[PDB]
Amino acid sequence: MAVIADPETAQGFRLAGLEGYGASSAEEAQSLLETLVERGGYALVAVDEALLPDPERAVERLMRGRDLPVLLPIAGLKEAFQGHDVEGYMRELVRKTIGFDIKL
Amino acid sequence: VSPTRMNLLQRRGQLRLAQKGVDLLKKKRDALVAEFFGLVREAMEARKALDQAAKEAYAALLLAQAFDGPEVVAGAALGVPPLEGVEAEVENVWGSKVPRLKATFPDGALLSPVGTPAYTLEASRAFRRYAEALIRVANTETRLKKIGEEIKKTTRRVNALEQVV
Amino acid sequence: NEIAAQIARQATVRPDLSGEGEKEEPFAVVFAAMGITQRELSYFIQEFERTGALSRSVLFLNKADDPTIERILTPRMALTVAEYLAFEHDYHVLVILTDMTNYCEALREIGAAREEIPGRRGYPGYMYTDLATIYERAGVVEGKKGSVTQIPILSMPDDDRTHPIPDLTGYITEGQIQLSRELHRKGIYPPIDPLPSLSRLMNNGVGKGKTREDHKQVSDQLYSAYANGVDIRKLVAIIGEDALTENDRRYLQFADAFERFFINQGQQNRSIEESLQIAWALLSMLPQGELKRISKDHIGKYYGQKLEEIWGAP
Amino acid sequence: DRTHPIPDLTGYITEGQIQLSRELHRKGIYPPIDPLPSLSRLMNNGVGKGKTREDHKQVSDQLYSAYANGVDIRKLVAIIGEDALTENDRRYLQFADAFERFFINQGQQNRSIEESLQIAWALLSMLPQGELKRISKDHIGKYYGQKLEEIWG
Amino acid sequence: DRTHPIPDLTGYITEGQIQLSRELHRKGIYPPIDPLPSLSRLMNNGVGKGKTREDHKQVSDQLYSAYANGVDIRKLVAIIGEDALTENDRRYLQFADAFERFFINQGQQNRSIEESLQIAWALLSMLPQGELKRISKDHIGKYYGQKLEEI
Amino acid sequence: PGGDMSEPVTQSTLRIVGAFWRLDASLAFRRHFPAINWNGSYSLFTSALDPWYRENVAEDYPELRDAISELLQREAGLQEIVQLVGPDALQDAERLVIEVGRIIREDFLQQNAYHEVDAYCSMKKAYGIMKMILAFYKEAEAAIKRGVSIDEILQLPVLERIGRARYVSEEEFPAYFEEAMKEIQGAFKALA
Amino acid sequence: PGGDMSEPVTQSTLRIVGAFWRLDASLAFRRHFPAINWNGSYSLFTSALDPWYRENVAEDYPELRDAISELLQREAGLQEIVQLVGPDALQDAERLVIEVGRIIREDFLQQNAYHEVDAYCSMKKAYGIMKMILAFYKEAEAAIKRGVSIDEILQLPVLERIGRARYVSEEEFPAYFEEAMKEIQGAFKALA
Amino acid sequence: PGGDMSEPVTQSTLRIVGAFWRLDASLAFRRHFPAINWNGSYSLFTSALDPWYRENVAEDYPELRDAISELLQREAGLQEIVQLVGPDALQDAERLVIEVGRIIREDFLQQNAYHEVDAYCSMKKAYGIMKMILAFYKEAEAAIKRGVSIDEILQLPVLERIGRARYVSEEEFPAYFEEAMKEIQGAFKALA
């Protein structure tokens, strides 16, 4: 449905039929997320990870009421052109879930 | 409780039942962890696939905005009706339920816009494949989060029993 | 009572397995019943009469309405006869004491009638010494061919193993055979529960020169496999069978078949070889490399048998 | 303590007892009579067709069953999350709460038997007709469906 | 068992008690005195100006309050996870560890009263100046040196 | 005194009698009469009476009785997990076992002494009721293996007929039993 | 002995006394004094003293006391849920209830017997403190209904005025009470 | 009777004895002899015996004993994670601690009573084994700090020499000890 990223990425999403949105700071990204959940944006709402480290922070208000939306971080256009250490994010996920580092 | 022999026997039976329940919960937690690790591995695989799709889609797009006019690619993007409608199937996760997302599709090139140049066209298909990887990543992440929630709940239950009751 | 009668009429010695090959030592059974009712008396009489086991047995029967001093004296007379036979005629004697709880209650009543201050839980302070003087008589003697073996039987008052009677009995004896109410209610006879049971002298009486060389390893492998299967049976209730691995399903099926075929033998009279054959057939359900507690020499000789034994004796 | 020699022997001698509850008392409910441990041995000699109303005994039995079910579901609520309940468990829980707040807590007022039976039927109407297995269908047809807020407003 | 007849009857006669802790003993702390369940009934009359330094009562109260808060933070962490902790909560959490490691775990040293007060003020300065609610303003600044322990 | 079964008179009687019918205060508080504790009761005359049951009630009455006792034992075993993790954490088979145990408790074990019909019950009436219960359990587990939701089974209308079978007069019962058996057959086999 | 309340002397005393002031060791070991267990205590003279309270303290004093008791009961009934699932999953209403119960426990029930001022407390001072607490609770509930975050409410500066009320001398209390009430209404008035 | 250590005889005995050697059947089940549980055991004579150890065994013997005890304590502190997530999920330092504990358990604490030379062990041999183990631990920790992998470390040949130490005769032990001490530093430093 809707993704919030750089305007070039948003233009590509429009080219693919997705409702791309432009943003360059946390405040307008949070406002777009709020207006999407308020208007009932269906299911997935991806956010640029270099824009918001955790989209769930703007969902702490609304998460209790609904379970349909799925929000996840993803690299932007120029961000994806440089190496992304997804393994560190997974290690952080495991350390949050269990409480200890799990790999070396 | 009234102090009597029968009450003492009942209390001992309750203690034995509590210990057995603690052991059962520990076994369940072990099974949940064994599932969680496979979820972690497949989530890593999905993340790598999505990153590759992102790289190829952005590489395809960069040519469109350079060789074709920015207005040309913008008009191509505006010509196609927006993609609307994501199917959220329910999935069973150890009693709990999680939405399994899969997107609808207007079949792509059948919806081709006035933006005819190929470099503009190639960016669209790559972005559709990008979204196809994105939904898989979202599904695996949701399943992993639900498994982690269950693990946390089981650990809290075990601690509460074996440190209070 | 059914298990007592079955053991009384089925017990025998195996001299061929020891290499002697002769039934030179006779076998006798001494049966003592304390505080039994008319129904139990008739049952025991008919059980001993109908199968010819009476011709090798001596019965001391004390009814519930008989004087309590007779209840006190009965096990002593039974043990006197047993000792006389074993150590003056080289017999092998098996002594069965039907209800030690009745004896303990009679002892408490006699002590109270003589105006003595009771000890713990209202029982006499010398109950340990009395029970010791009853149980210690059994044994083997240097230079004598005979022997005396005891199988006391007692009902736990409230199924409490911390009650003084079982607490002292297990403190004097060499283990216990535990009956399970769950197995009995599930329709299994005899309802003996292997997990809480224990024999403290088993390792001395089994080996290569007696019974068979694979006895102990088979026994402990069966114990471990049954315990694991029973544990898995509790988890499968909540997490479902499809969430289990293959080995967990194997253990679950092994536990079910073990309960259905090994414990539930009914009124059959199984020799040690038949029991070991059934045990190996049950163990064959587990994978080849899962028998970590058995040496490869026995596995190569006995593994792979199919379940065809219990159906051979309806 | 119900196992103390005095109440034990008294209960063994007499024909029932009315047992008060401190848990009900601490919540402001008066009279704090706990119905489950209470008992009347001669109850059914004075109720029936020619005595009081013919639905008395079955209504009492259904009330006891439903209250016991609600009390038991309170224990499950104390162990797992409240949101995990089924709608039937929620109905039983609400029935128990309304029962305690209205049928027991009556203050210093005087109630005739017909008014008490009316309140009992109003409380029983909080549950579906299929759950009233201890009441005959004739009495259900005659008395079910009245509303609790209709009695006083 | 503190309800055993011997300690129970002893408590009814004496004017307080010093209670040892097994948890501190497992942690290796010596002497393993747990300050939360301990009490001295005649303490309020034996300390103060002319008896000791004039800030004894207030620093004792502040130490007890801060250690109790840290123990509550510890109990909260071990259930719902550390990630929810506010900066003040983790500050109290680390103050509790510093307390058990320096103030209680003295070993075989014969500390004077002034040395003990100096150490107590040293780890009291670990908290914000406005958080020391029990201590009056006049002793703060005079003794709120904002210095770590010299040991 | 105080309901303590460790009292010396109770223990002395326990060692002499052949049948023990322990009463439960919890069932009495719930008004579930006759309020006999199934777990704490036993009888030693069960095996000696089997030929009479075979000759006078039915050829396979002992098998049905053993099946009912085994079902009660399984329900008692599963209650230890139910009290730990709640009824919703079990699988469908365990939930069916719990429901069948509840049905057995409320429709076969319960009996009203002051009812004009339920106060007495012949052996054949009990045999018919328990046969109906066992047939329903078999059909229900067969349906469970076929993917039918457990909540669908619990709303099946034959449950009301099974529950009300206890109130049928001794003369109307032989036809009521056949009608209910045919209804149970239809509710699963014909619906599938 | 050992704090056992089933001891013969305590049970014999409780049958004749009109008030029961139970002390709790758990409160005493946390230096929470006077340490009366308000859930285990009771009094039988509270009903007969209402006319005197109305004539001499305030017309609506009993209703205020009942409201305070109800708030304490609700806090007690929420604390076990807090201990089970954690405060983070609770709504704003019950979190406000918990905070108000904590304020009541630490600023009204607590009393230092060695402090120069706090050692003694007149009835009117307690009435004023209770009225202040109830007014703050009402205003905070209205603010929460207006969508204000409870975390913002906890940071309000009037809470320190409420907590410091018990240390104010008897002579200065009447003006302090009016100032505190005006501040309490103004703080949520300004928040809007 | 029953294995409860709270029984009055055991409580009275433990108040006057100087040492307690807790035999455990769990250790014997997994074939670990002499099967004394080092977690529950204790001794009160070490401080009074330290000068004798310094004069008759070595000046640093108490330090090595304390280091071994600390290693065992830390290894026991990791038992939760190694059982929850498995050994391979640990880091290199934690896995090194686990493997050092395994080496200690298998080569120093364990002792075969029926062996010809392993049945008896003097203080000097124990000191040599402890020093060899500690030297290997320090070298392995340094190698881990220098980027070597734990899997590579666990394949060294000097581990066999450490394992076979307890089977060496009493008179031939010093030469074996010197050679193994040289080999321990050779296996790491010569590889770099």
From Swiss-Prot, chain A:
A GO molecular-function descriptor: proton-transporting ATPase activity, rotational mechanism
Pfam families assigned: ATP-synt_F
Cystines in this chain: none
Keyword Heme in record: no
Biological process annotations from GO: proton motive force-driven plasma membrane ATP synthesis
Keyword terms: ATP synthesis, Hydrogen ion transport, Ion transport, Transport
Protein family according to the UniProt entry: Belongs to the V-ATPase F subunit family.
Function description: Produces ATP from ADP in the presence of a proton gradient across the membrane.
The name this protein goes by in its record: V-type ATP synthase subunit F
Provenance organism: Thermus thermophilus (strain ATCC 27634 / DSM 579 / HB8)
Organism lineage: Bacteria, Thermotogati, Deinococcota, Deinococci, Thermales
Swiss-Prot record, chain B:
Entry keywords, A to Z: ATP synthesis, Hydrogen ion transport, Ion transport, Transport
Annotated TM spans: none
Keyword set includes Ion transport: yes
GO BP terms in the entry: proton motive force-driven plasma membrane ATP synthesis
GO MF, any single term: ATP binding
Function of the protein: Produces ATP from ADP in the presence of a proton gradient across the membrane.
Family, per entry: Belongs to the V-ATPase D subunit family.
UniProt name for this protein: V-type ATP synthase subunit D
Swiss-Prot record, chain C:
One example of a Gene Ontology biological process annotation: proton motive force-driven plasma membrane ATP synthesis
Gene Ontology MF terms: ATP binding; proton-transporting ATP synthase activity, rotational mechanism
Top-level taxon of the source organism: Bacteria
UniProt keywords, alphabetically: ATP synthesis, Hydrogen ion transport, Ion transport, Transport
Entry keyword annotation includes Ion transport: yes
Family: Belongs to the ATPase alpha/beta chains family.
Physiological role: Produces ATP from ADP in the presence of a proton gradient across the membrane. The V-type beta chain is a regulatory subunit.
The protein's name in its UniProt record: V-type ATP synthase beta chain
Organism expressing this protein natively: Thermus thermophilus (strain ATCC 27634 / DSM 579 / HB8)
Residues of the whole record sequence present: 161 to 474 of 478
Curated annotation (Swiss-Prot), chains F, G, H:
Segments forming a coiled coil: none
Job description of the protein: Produces ATP from ADP in the presence of a proton gradient across the membrane. The V-type alpha chain is a catalytic subunit.
Family, similarity comment: Belongs to the ATPase alpha/beta chains family.
Protein name: V-type ATP synthase alpha chain
Highest classification ranks of the organism: Bacteria, Thermotogati, Deinococcota, Deinococci, Thermales
Range within the parent protein: 387 to 578 of 578
